[PDB]
């Protein structure tokens, strides 16, 4: 029976195992010439092939380390399996389950940056007691906490500060009656310490400086806090938090030209033995990509803390820098505590997986499956997690060809967490009859050819096990009307030798299927995200759709309610399309004609309790019914902050409940227990 194994691979065992996983090769030299060598295993068995000549290569996702994920972070592994001896074959993919899981009691590193310009004085006088009030809270969320302190103003150089009289070179603060400290760019103060009181001791002795222009030099301080791993005191098995407070704009790169400071920031850290950013007056400000990659590599989490006067700027920033959270800081600065706790709750909630050192020929399609069984296709991150929760993923890697490097590796890692998966990738591209080749076999035209895997390699224009024929006649095409060898070969002795091609090689039993002739999307072969299959685009692992236009993007599809395109709408190519008429918004969340929470979201009383109705044979019964089911019994709160509602059931009974919104949305039910 002709199949893909038959009409395509008629050259070698290697191609037979490269086409499809099912394809099997027989190396028995006594097999009659004409029968398909690469075919179904049962077919080869039916042709009494030698069992040692039967080739049955199978890929595997073999786990080397499967250590249990710990209960407490007191090594503690969050990612299982720890290390994968992945083994892949050409143009094949393989799947495997990874259970990322945020262990409670993970150590926390906090480095409290701080601005020190002239407008920062009151906030300093308020933050003098910060740090014991941060530990007092964080003792609930982790067992090991270490805090650090910093400072920054701007580049110590004209025109950015006041320098006259020549006695104001030391004191830019003379024109006003009070005096304040000189120029300085960044000065590390305290290294991350277990004794939290050290931060309180260190901040008291600091004092405000003065500059001229409103923006300040914070980016230099952040980069230096990041890069001096040894100086700061970073842990490796902990959570790194970087708190960055200010109350005005912040200078960016190339702003330093106004002083003649033109050397771009090298990314190294120049904090000498005096803890002062030495190259402050000779090195430019830091870009935004250097910032991001240095925060990534050191597993650093950034928490901005602007004053409303600027949030819209910073939140317009913490969005071009993943892993970042912005906040409102009061002018007195008495809210940075609760801001930092909320930011810690937020950073741990989101659970995203990043892939590093992934070779170009490999593509990974994720397929989340967060809490419940939401096998949410095309998703690689989950929200709404709680500390102690476990998640699972279905990640599948597809290789494009058999790469020259036998052993390659890449890492899949949770955001800002130590433990991560190391992938040992092996490209198996070796047969068994290859090792027992017989070069210069006398049967190959008196001994001028090499015999291997049941074929004598005759010279050009000659074919067969003995090169019996050169010129001549058999049927070289599947159909009479079809051209001989698909206009691509010669009917040489009943076999179609494909013509030479500059671009590559022509394959197939009759030179029928090519390899470089597929369609495009945007000037790119199958959108640059697919692979060429005899006239049709086939996508890679993480490319969905027929045209391979779009990957597992969801960021714009994510809705603040907690699902893709809110309820109505498919997330096609990272964008949400409204399906319900009259509904609009970022994810079609706003709908004036749509039923309210009291009308449509009653299936908690129908699907969760007294299971009946629709959505019973599908995984959507508790998909929408996942709110807090409070067991209230007709409380005397029939409408004070929301709209109270009551409906009539089939048996003429009333059920009273009320939940509209408390703080930007609350999935809390107030359904009564016993209906009346």
């Amino acid at each position: 029976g002709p199949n893909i194994c038959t009409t395509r691979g008629v050259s070698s065992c290697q191609q037979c195992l490269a086409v499809s996983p099912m394809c099997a090769w027989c190396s028995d030299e006594a097999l009659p010439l004409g029968s398909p060598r690469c075919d179904l295993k049962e077919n080869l068995l039916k042709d009494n092939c030698a069992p040692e000549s039967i080739e049955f290569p199978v890929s595997e996702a073999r786990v080397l380390e499967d250590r249990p994920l710990s209960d407490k972070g007191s090594q503690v592994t969050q990612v299982s399996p720890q290390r994968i001896a992945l083994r892949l074959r050409p143009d094949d993919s393989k799947n495997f389950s990874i259970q990322v899981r945020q262990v409670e009691d993970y150590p926390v590193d906090i480095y409290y940056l701080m601005d020190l310009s002239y407008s920062m004085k009151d906030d300093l006088w308020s933050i003098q007691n910060l740090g014991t009030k941060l530990a007092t809270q964080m003792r609930k969320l982790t067992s090991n906490l270490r805090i650090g302190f910093g400072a920054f103003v701007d580049k110590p150089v004209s025109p950015y500060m006041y320098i006259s009289p020549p006695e104001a070179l030391e004191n830019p603060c003379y024109d006003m009656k009070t005096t304040c400290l000189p120029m300085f760019g960044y000065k590390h103060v305290l290294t991350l310490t277990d004794q939290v009181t050290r931060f309180n001791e260190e901040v008291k002795k600091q004092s405000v400086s003065r500059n001229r222009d409103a923006p300040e030099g914070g980016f230099d301080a952040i980069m230096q806090a990041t890069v001096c791993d040894e100086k700061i005191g970073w842990r490796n098995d902990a959570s790194h938090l970087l708190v960055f407070t200010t109350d005005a704009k912040t200078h960016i790169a190339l702003d330093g030209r106004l002083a003649g400071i033109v050397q771009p920031n090298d990314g190294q850290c120049h904090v000498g033995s005096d803890n002062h950013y030495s190259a402050s007056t000779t090195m430019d400000y830091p870009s935004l990509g250097l910032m991001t990659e240095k925060l990534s590599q050191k597993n650093i989490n950034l928490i901005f803390a602007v004053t409303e006067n600027v949030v819209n700027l910073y939140q317009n920033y913490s969005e071009l820098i993943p892993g970042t959270t912005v906040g409102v800081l009061s002018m007195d600065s008495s809210n940075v505590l609760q801001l930092i706790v909320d930011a810690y709750g937020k950073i741990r909630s989101k659970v995203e997986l990043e892939v590093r050192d992934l070779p170009e020929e490999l593509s990974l399609s994720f397929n989340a499956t967060c809490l419940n069984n939401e096998v949410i296709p095309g998703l690689k991150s989950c929200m709404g997690l709680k500390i102690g929760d476990t998640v699972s993923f279905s990640i599948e890697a597809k290789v494009r060809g058999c790469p020259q490097e036998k052993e390659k590796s890449f890492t899949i890692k949770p955001v800002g967490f130590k433990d991560s998966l190391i992938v040992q990738v092996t490209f198996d591209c070796d047969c068994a009859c290859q090792a027992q080749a017989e070069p210069n076999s006398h049967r190959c035209n008196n001994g001028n050819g090499t015999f291997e895997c049941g074929v004598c390699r005759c010279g050009p224009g000659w074919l067969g096990s003995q090169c019996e024929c050169s010129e001549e006649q058999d049927e070289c095409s599947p159909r009479e009307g079809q051209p001989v060898c698909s206009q691509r070969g010669e009917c040489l002795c009943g076999q179609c030798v494909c013509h030479s091609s500059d671009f590559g090689k022509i394959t197939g039993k009759y030179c029928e299927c090519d390899d470089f002739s597929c369609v495009r999307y945007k000037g790119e072969m199958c959108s640059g995200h697919g692979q060429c299959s005899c006239g049709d685009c086939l996508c890679d692992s993480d490319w969905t759709g027929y045209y391979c236009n779009c990957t597992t993007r969801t960021d714009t599809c994510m809705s603040s309610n907690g699902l893709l395109c809110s309820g109505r709408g498919k997330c096609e190519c990272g964008s949400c399309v409204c399906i319900q008429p009259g509904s609009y918004g970022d994810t079609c969340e706003k709908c004036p004609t749509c039923p309210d929470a009291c009308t449509f979201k009653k299936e908690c009383v129908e699907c969760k309790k007294f299971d009946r109705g629709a959505l019973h044979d599908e995984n959507t019964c508790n998909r929408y019914c996942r709110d807090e089911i409070e067991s209230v019994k007709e409380l005397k709160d029939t409408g004070k902050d929301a709209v109270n509602c009551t409906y009539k059931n089939e048996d003429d009974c009333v059920v009273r409940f009320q939940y509209y919104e408390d703080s930007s949305g609350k999935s809390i039910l107030y359904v009564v227990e016993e209906p009346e």
């Binding site: 004209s158 025109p159 320098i163 006259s164 009289p165 104001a168 024109d175 001229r212 222009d213 409103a214 923006p215 704009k249 960016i252 790169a253 190339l254 702003d255 106004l258 002083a259 003649g260 033109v262 050397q263 771009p264 870009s287 935004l288 990509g289 250097l290 991001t292 990659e293 700027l313 317009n316 920033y317 071009l320 820098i321 993943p322 992934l358 050009p460 224009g461 051209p483 001989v484 060898c485 206009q487 691509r488 010669e490 009917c491 040489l492 013509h499 030479s500 091609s501 500059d502 369609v519 995200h529 006239g535 049709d536 990957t551 008429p581 009259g582 609009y584 004036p592 004609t593 009551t646």
Partner: protein, 912 residues
């Protein structure tokens, strides 16, 4: 394109220094041309880095530079009580070196001046300066336009404003060709920005050596502003001159503002009196939109086209979400005072942290093609990370997104190669505007020399078909029966200033796509695959055509007689000369492929005259403009005559059309239907059959037409179909023209409902009731003069069951009720209709509505307790209807239907 990177000569200058950082082509004492290269931090008089300005001449040896001498020797005086001194230490003289016809205007943007208020002080604030030294000596006179004294507190104004100490004059300047001088000062009015202007003819006059305070009567500075957008905008970071917004004599300004609107940044266009004309907003936050502003005519229309740099631009990719690759915007100038909207195109570098867009220097017609070309430098680009310079070439649409040429940094890591560029002036009278690139980290300046360019033109001429029966030649030295046929080649190269000794190696290959034992055609004499011919193109632009004598091999030599014969042509310059530096740089088309076949399948009459027959039809005649149109045009191609070679259909599609796929008399496909008419020539890019068409063969092709967003298609579009073949006599069939009309009827759907529909009774003003009516032209076609008529039972009287409180129409729709609603705020069912009872018709009119727009109108009302309690055992049904219509469509004759519709609203009452 040329920018020879093998001899980048080096004007090496004082070791330390930053020799570089700024430069400009300037004249000599008697005509001629030299090079003025800035060099901060050089030649300290008392060993403090003052930063002299060098005057490097032109020489290929790349020596050191003579100096333009200034009075770098301090100046000091006092009028009556102000001991003012202009401190001269730690400034970057040469940071801008802009010149004029006989005047060097080299500036020292961080120069000082200390406005003490006698005992009190207001600081040595960098007032900048511009040391206007005249070459040929003469008055070496200096004028810092911000040198107006102050007693500090008087003109702090108590606003901190109306005072302009920190100008940093010289941070940018372009001597206007009229004879003025602008001195962009990013520190004007507390860093908000400045722009000081002054004539150059009179400025030399108004100098008193030794004087510290004096203001020229002809100064004109930008006015302080209080808009919190501008606050610390660094306005005037970089300036330019250009006839942008139609102010010819009051020639505009292109004042940059790379950090405006809270780091968004902007590039503003202003007149001579500092009045804005447009404003270009930055696309990405913190991307530094406007670091380097270049004004040039890329599209070759006569209108100056703005180019804006965003050096810290970060891009999002599948494999990398945040990658600093830089971005350069382009804004083409539309006719009239039309506003500059979205960026016309975006250029983008590939190297990480390359700071792409950090310096844009209009190179002029670098390849002399009629379109201006620019240079965008990457200080930290290149695979190694030492720096790159990427050159882009302009065209009618704008700039091609891929760099035509790229230069790698020859100086080591840290050299900041490419920080500053210049163009527009040939440095050696070679006919091409060279480029002079600074590397301030390496204290050197490497100049790249544009070499004369040739335009490659490739053309391979072969006979239309091959007839085995015609054997009029013989194979030399043998007797092979050859179907000989002549093949001609033609390649020309034009250009300006081409060297008088220029030659090319014309190589032609026969039987290309086929191997040694699969060749069908060879050279008669040498019996070889091909040969190379010599051409002398030195000083001659017309092409050279040579014809080769090609033959057909024997029938028994090879078996394949049906596979097509494919030929490929290549043209390349002779091998590089000693010392590298190729005399020219080759660009344009380089590879061309042509194919022919043997006369076959024309019958038995030897007269192969095809008769291709095509039938066409139109589906989906009403074309909604920019809709989800699914059009499957079906045509059948038949050859009632004889064999047609490479006969394929060429169809001209509009700009908005896209190909989704398709089968056809395929049985060979369903996803592939190609299309010819692709950009220039390529009038064959479509699929083949001509391969060839068998006699009486009948293949019908079905392909999908997806009408995309095309609002500029016009009143109609025309589709042209004709089968194109390689034949000479009757090459194509009869022309099939399909004028598929675009007569656009937009579908507008009227909807309406009551909120709540039902009304239950629980156990003084009642709850409010909302009636929702939504208007949305889901039909993508545009409608003008849309009319909405609201018909309601009664006249909104209090005697009715419902009392209308107010009508709140949003979405830009205006309604006119009669009689007007809300005369008072207050707080067997009978069919009462609009026609029977007196009616209050509310008419809403829309002059113009865009595609996909939506409208929303909210109706406010309240319940009546006395009326509700009446008839407790009676059921009340409330009915309201809405009607709408479209008066006409903006088309001559769309005789299908005037869009209209209606809505129904139902309200019921229940008993508890």
């Amino acid at each position: 394109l040329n920018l020879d990177p093998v001899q980048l000569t080096f004007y090496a200058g004082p070791n330390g220094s930053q020799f570089g950082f700024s430069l400009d082509f300037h004249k000599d004492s008697h005509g001629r041309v030299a090079i003025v290269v800035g060099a901060p931090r050089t030649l300290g008089p008392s060993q403090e880095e003052t930063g002299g300005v060098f005057l490097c001449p032109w020489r290929a040896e790349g020596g050191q530079c003579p100096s333009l001498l200034f009075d770098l020797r301090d100046e000091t005086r006092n009028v009556g009580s102000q001991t003012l001194q202009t401190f001269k230490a730690r400034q970057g003289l040469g940071a801008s070196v802009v010149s004029w016809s006989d005047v060097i205007v080299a500036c020292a943007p961080w120069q000082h001046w200390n406005v003490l208020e006698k005992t009190e002080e207001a600081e040595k604030t960098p007032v900048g300066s511009c040391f206007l030294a005249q070459p040929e000596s003469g008055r070496r006179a200096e004028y810092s336009p911000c040198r107006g004294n102050t007693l500090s507190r008087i003109y702090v104004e108590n606003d901190f404003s109306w005072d302009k100490r920190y100008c940093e004059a010289g941070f940018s300047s372009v001597v206007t060709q009229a004879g003025e001088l602008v001195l962009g000062a990013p520190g004007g009015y507390y860093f908000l920005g400045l722009l000081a202007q002054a004539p150059v003819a009179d400025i030399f006059s108004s100098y008193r050596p030794g004087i510290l305070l004096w203001h020229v009567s002809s100064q004109s500075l930008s006015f302080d502003s209080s808009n919190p957008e501008y606050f610390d905008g660094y306005w005037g970071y970089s300036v330019a001159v250009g006839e942008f917004d139609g102010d010819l004599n009051t020639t505009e300004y292109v004042v940059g503002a790379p950090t405006w609107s809270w780091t968004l940044g902007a590039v503003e266009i202003l007149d001579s009196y500092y009045q804005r004309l447009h404003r270009l907003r930055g696309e990405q936050m913190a991307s530094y939109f406007g670091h380097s502003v270049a004004v040039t005519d890329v599209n070759g229309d006569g209108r100056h086209d703005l180019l804006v740099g965003a050096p810290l631009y970060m891009e999002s990719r599948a494999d990398r979400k945040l990658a600093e690759v830089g971005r350069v915007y382009l804004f083409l100038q539309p006719r009239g005072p039309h506003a500059l909207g979205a960026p016309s195109l975006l250029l983008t570098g590939t190297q990480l942290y390359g700071r792409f867009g950090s310096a844009i220097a209009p190179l002029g017609d670098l390849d002399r093609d009629g379109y201006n070309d620019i240079a965008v430098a990457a200080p930290y680009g290149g695979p190694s990370g030492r720096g790159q310079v990427l050159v882009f070439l302009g065209q009618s649409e704008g700039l091609r997104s891929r760099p035509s040429q790229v230069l790698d940094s020859p100086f080591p890591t840290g050299s900041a190669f490419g920080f500053s560029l210049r163009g527009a002036v040939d440095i050696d009278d070679n006919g091409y505007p060279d480029l002079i690139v600074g590397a301030y980290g390496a204290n050197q300046v490497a100049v790249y020399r544009a070499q004369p360019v040739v335009k490659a033109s490739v053309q391979l001429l072969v006979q239309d078909s091959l007839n085995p029966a015609v054997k009029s030649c013989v194979l030399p030295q043998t007797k092979t029966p050859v179907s000989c046929f002549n093949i001609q080649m033609c390649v020309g190269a034009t250009g300006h200033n081409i060297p008088q000794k220029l030659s090319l190696n014309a190589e032609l290959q026969l039987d290309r796509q086929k191997p040694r034992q699969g060749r069908r055609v060879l050279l008669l004499g040498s019996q070889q695959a091909g040969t190379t011919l010599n051409l002398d193109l030195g000083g001659k632009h017309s092409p050279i055509c040579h014809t080769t004598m090609a033959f057909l091999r024997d029938e028994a030599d090879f078996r394949d007689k049906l596979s097509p014969i494919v030929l490929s042509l290549n043209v390349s310059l002779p091998p590089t000369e000693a010392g590298m530096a190729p005399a020219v740089v080759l660009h344009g088309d380089t590879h061309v492929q042509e194919q022919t076949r043997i006369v076959l399948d024309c019958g038995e009459d030897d007269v192969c005259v095809p008769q291709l027959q095509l039938t066409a039809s139109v589906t989906g005649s009403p074309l909604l403009v920019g809709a989800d149109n699914v059009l499957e045009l079906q045509m059948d191609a038949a050859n009632e005559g004889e064999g047609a070679y490479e006969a394929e259909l060429a169809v001209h599609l509009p700009q908005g059309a896209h190909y989704m796929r398709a089968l056809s008399n395929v049985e060979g496909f369903e996803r592939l239907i190609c299309n010819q008419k692709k950009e220039n020539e390529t009038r064959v890019v479509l699929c083949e059959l001509g391969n060839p068409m068998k006699k009486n063969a009948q293949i019908g092709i079905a392909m999908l037409v997806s009408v995309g967003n095309l609002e500029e298609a016009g009143e109609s579009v025309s589709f042209q179909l004709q089968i194109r073949s390689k034949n000479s006599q009757n090459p194509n069939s009869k022309i099939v023209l399909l004028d598929v009309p675009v007569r656009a009827e937009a579908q507008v759907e009227l909807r309406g409902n009551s909120f709540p529909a039902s009304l239950v009774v629980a156990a003084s003003w009642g709850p409010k009731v909302e009636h929702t009516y939504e208007l949305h032209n889901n039909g993508p076609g545009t409608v003008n003069g849309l009319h909405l008529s609201i018909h309601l039972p009664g006249q909104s009287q209090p005697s009715d069951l419902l009392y209308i409180l107010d009508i709140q129409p949003q979405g830009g729709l205006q309604c006119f009720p009669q009689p007007p609603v809300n005369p008072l705020k207050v707080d067997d069912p009978v069919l009462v209709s609009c026609d029977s009872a007196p009616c209050t018709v509310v008419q809403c009119d829309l002059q113009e509505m865009a595609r996909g727009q939506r409208a929303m109108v909210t109706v406010l009302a309240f319940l009546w307790l006395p009326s509700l309690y009446q008839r407790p055992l009676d059921q009340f049904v409330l009915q309201s209807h809405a009607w709408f219509n479209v008066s006409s469509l903006p088309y001559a004759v769309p005789p299908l239907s005037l869009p209209r519709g209606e809505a129904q609203v139902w309200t019921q009452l229940l008993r508890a």
